[PDB]
Amino acid sequence: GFQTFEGDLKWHHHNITYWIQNYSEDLPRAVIDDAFARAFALWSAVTPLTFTRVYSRDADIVIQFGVAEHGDGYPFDGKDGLLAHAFPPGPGIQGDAHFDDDELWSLGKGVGYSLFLVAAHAFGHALGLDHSSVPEALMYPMYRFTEGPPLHKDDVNGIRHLYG
């Protein structure tokens, strides 16, 4: 459409802040908190960025669970299909990460979608990454569960082109 983003689509400070605005009821709150921390930890290991949880909408990355139309004009679609979406770094809505609350959120081996894997993917965008055409990359646009390490060369290559 006609919407444009502001800026070069990467962060220009090293301490990225995030706000968990709400929760899926599917997992305990602390388990969700840790799943997000673990997803952020994948990227903090390979970049000069730190990720700091804050408690207001002042945050660079605002995390929200939503159903259907949830405030940004890009509605979720109910069970399955679209699982989450994320906006590239920048001001305002930029940087944000939303998860479809109509999904059953699980962690590995759970019968639903892995919150950990989905968050790792979404946060990739929230740091500036596009989709990959490499099927085994984390940034591949289609969810496939796996227990093996999520990051592949293509992902680290993308992130390093952004942050060094």
């Binding site: 919407q3 940004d72 969810y143």
Partner: peptide, 8 residues
């Protein structure tokens, strides 16, 4: 816009 992640 955002980029979306899709299931099978």
């Amino acid at each position: 816009x955002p980029l979306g992640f899709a299931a099978r």
